[PDB]
Design a protein around this ligand. Structure first.
Ligand SMILES: CO[C@@H]1O[C@H](CO)[C@@H](O[C@@H]2O[C@H](CO)[C@@H](S[C@@H]3O[C@H](CO)[C@@H](O[C@@H]4O[C@H](CO)[C@@H](O)[C@H](O)[C@H]4O)[C@H](O)[C@H]3O)[C@H](O)[C@H]2O)[C@H](O)[C@H]1O
Ligand SMILES: CO[C@@H]1O[C@H](CO)[C@@H](O[C@@H]2O[C@H](CO)[C@@H](S[C@@H]3O[C@H](CO)[C@@H](O[C@@H]4O[C@H](CO)[C@@H](O)[C@H](O)[C@H]4O)[C@H](O)[C@H]3O)[C@H](O)[C@H]2O)[C@H](O)[C@H]1O
Ligand SMILES: [Ca+2]
Length: 629
């Protein structure tokens, strides 16, 4: 039997679970896939409300696991895994083993430079630049008996809104698409949505391929997928709790545990430099593990030919603290039920745990907030690191890893999503490293939570940075980083971030006994329940300051390149964001948004983001379990 839980907060989880699963609320598609948000007019990471992400799927898993804990029914959790495997992990038809089996571990991919401006793309492939060796492929094919990769592609056009269909048929749903392709300055407003399976049926003469990379000959028909490591690691974290909670009740989610374990094994591809170059010596090709930074980088991607057999796989040189998950690393390296089948799976994850904790500590500012990250590829072209730039294992510090429009580390959300995992690790193991990080971080954030007399509240929203951490010396450890500072630019009432914050403070308070953290977590949960509830979960009105880009953001299209989106929209130099997504004018909220822009006002929206609703529900569940009385 599971220990008794606080009935007040358990009821709140149950109420939220009902609203999220209610068919009338519209959080899911007819195929059972959760959308990024109920509302369709939505641009922030994905550019349409009804596309889904692997992030949403991992929150769906977490939600169902918690529901299993209170209802004793885990069929919903097993269902979240079935939907994931069927729709987000490319099937045998989506990543043909005929092509994947032609992979060459000694030449994983062909080098191509990254540019700081989208106008420099397509990027030219250069076969003369060195590429290191992939040491884990043989481990995976041997353990699993296939060359296909088991990980989630990060974004999916659920209802085929863009019209690419499945494997170029234009009519099936869901539809594998990707967006970001052109570097740090390519915001969500500057992409050209493209299909993962490109047979040249849509777009230009060669589909959309030559908008991004340029080779010596004619582009081949090909498929390509991109993983979001933070989502796959969250899926493992969620499955661990589902396993623990099921066993406390004589139930089992054994089959889902096996899927999470296999996913964690392939997830190791994010531990490697993009083109397998040695960590700390970027001009040199790696010989295997010397190319592993052991952190959960921004992505690992793979692809291959559709009508001819060949394939490639790349890791990522860019690392952001917000993607790390020491808890998932702890589970995969120590729990016998989650031991990966591969020979080095568990030990690699053990190395990642130690490295991740060093990374967090190295990035901790004077105040306590965690700074951006580091890269093994300066400017995305393995350029020389400027003199005076701090390093972590030879990797140069970057304030906003991967994206600069807006900076990937200017959103407060990265703080809570990531530190929440450190709090779970601390709660379970009492790890001294996690303790030192949390004591300082929690003291910082507790001084930034503002409660108003009318029941509303505010927490940091946009943050900024000054300075850099001192160069990491593993034997010296944390120096205090006196010259690295966080600055809060503005506060807000992001319900998803506040929920993640309550979750982090709850785990931490439960282990440390810090009363200040416990009462702030409860006050946050209470304020949200009492003042922000609505018939669909919780919400508030927020300003969408970037929406002017719907109409004024020019999208770069190379000189001479012309094509068409499936609905007929012409792609050519001079198009704006809206010109290649004309179906958006049919959105119920379109006239309202345009009217605001016309009057010189900032459009506002009342949004129901799936992850935020689940975050709130899970946060109530966690509080109910850790503070029974
Ligand atoms: C943050 O988002 C991610 O950004 C990165 C930025 O780099 C994106 O990475 C890029 O992804 C592209 C696909 O989405 C690929 S294009 C692809 O590269 C392979 C490997 O080099 C090429 O394979 C070669 O093809 C030749 C035949 O055409 C063969 O002769 C040769 O042996 C093959 O290796 C393929 O042709 C290209 O089309 C970029 O390589 C990669 O940088 C990431 O996608 C975003 O999600
Ligand atoms: C007077 O001018 C206005 O000032 C206000 C001051 O509050 C500005 O409002 C603020 O705008 C910010 C940007 O629009 C948002 S932060 C925004 O939040 C969303 C939801 O949490 C984030 O999306 C998530 O991003 C993740 C990381 O990429 C994804 O993984 C996830 O799926 C997404 O949901 C997004 O990244 C953030 O940028 C403030 O909340 C708001 O107060 C206003 O803009 C000015 O006009
Ligand atoms: Ca830009």
């Amino acid at each position: 039997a599971s220990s008794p839980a606080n009935k007040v907060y358990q009821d709140r989880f149950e109420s939220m679970y009902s609203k999220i699963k209610d068919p009338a609320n519209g959080y899911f598609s007819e195929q059972g896939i959760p959308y990024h948000s109920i509302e369709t007019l939505m641009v922030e990471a994905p550019d349409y409300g009804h596309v889904t992400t692997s992030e949403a799927m991992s929150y769906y898993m977490w939600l169902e696991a918690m529901h299993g804990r209170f209802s004793g029914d885990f069929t919903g959790f097993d269902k979240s895994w079935s939907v994931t495997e069927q729709y987000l992990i490319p099937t045998e038809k989506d990543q043909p083993n005929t092509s994947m089996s032609r992979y060459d571990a000694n030449k994983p991919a062909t080098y191509a430079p990254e540019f700081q401006d989208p106008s420099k793309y397509p990027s030219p492939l250069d076969t003369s630049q060195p590429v290191g060796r992939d040491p884990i492929n043989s481990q995976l094919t041997s353990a699993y008996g296939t060359s296909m990769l088991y990980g989630m592609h990060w974004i999916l056009d659920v209802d085929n809104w863009y019209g690419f269909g499945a494997r170029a048929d234009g009519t099936s749903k869901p539809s594998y698409i990707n967006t970001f392709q052109r570097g740090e300055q390519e915001s969500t407003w500057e992409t050209i949505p493209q299909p993962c399976w490109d047979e040249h049926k849509f777009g230009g003469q060669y589909g959309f391929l030559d908008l991004f990379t340029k080779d010596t000959g004619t582009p081949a028909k090909q498929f390509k997928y991109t993983n979001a490591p933070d989502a796959d690691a969250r899926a493992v974290q969620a499955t661990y709790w589902a396993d623990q909670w099921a066993k406390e009740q004589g139930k089992s989610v054994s089959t889902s545990v096996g899927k999470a374990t296999k996913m964690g094994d392939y997830l190791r591809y994010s531990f490697f430099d993009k083109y397998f170059r040695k960590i700390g010596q970027p001009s040199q090709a790696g010989t295997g593990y010397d190319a592993a930074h052991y952190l959960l980088s921004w992505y690992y991607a793979w692809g291959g030919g559709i009508d001819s057999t060949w394939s490639w796989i790349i890791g990522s040189s860019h690392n952001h603290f917000g993607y790390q998950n020491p808890f998932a690393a702890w589970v995969l390296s120590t729990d016998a039920n989650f031991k990966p089948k591969s020979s080095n799976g568990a030990s690699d994850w053990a190395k990642s745990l130690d490295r991740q904790l060093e990374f967090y500590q190295w990035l901790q500012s004077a105040e306590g907030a965690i700074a951006g990250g580091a890269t093994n590829s300066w400017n995305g072209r393995y350029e020389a690191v400027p003199s005076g730039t701090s390093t972590f294992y030879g990797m140069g510090y970057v304030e906003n890893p991967v994206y600069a429009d807006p900076g990937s580390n200017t959103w407060f959300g990265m703080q809570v999503w990531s530190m929440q995992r450190v709090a779970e690790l601390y709660y379970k193991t009492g790890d001294a490293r996690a303790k030192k990080l949390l004591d300082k971080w929690a003291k910082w954030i507790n001084g930034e939570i503002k409660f108003n007399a009318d029941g509303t509240f505010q927490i940091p929203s946009t943050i900024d940075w000054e300075g850099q951490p001192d160069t990491w010396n593993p034997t010296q450890g944390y120096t205090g980083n006196a010259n690295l500072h966080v600055k809060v630019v503005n506060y807000g009432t992001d319900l998803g971030c506040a929920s993640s914050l309550a979750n982090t403070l709850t785990y931490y308070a439960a282990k440390s006994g810090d009363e200040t953290s416990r009462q702030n977590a409860q006050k946050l949960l209470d304020a949200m329940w009492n003042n922000y509830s609505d018939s669909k979960g919780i919400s508030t009105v927020e300003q969408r300051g970037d929406y002017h880009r719907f109409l004024d953001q020019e999208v770069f299209v190379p000189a001479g390149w012309t094509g068409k989106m499936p609905n007929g929209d012409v792609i050519k130099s001079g198009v704006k964001f809206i010109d290649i997504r004309s179906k958006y004018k049919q959105d119920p909220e379109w006239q309202t948004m345009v009217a605001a822009l016309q009057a010189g006002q900032v459009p506002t929206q009342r949004l129901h983001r799936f992850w935020a609703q689940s975050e709130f529900a899970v946060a109530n569940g966690v509080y109910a379990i850790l503070f029974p009385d």
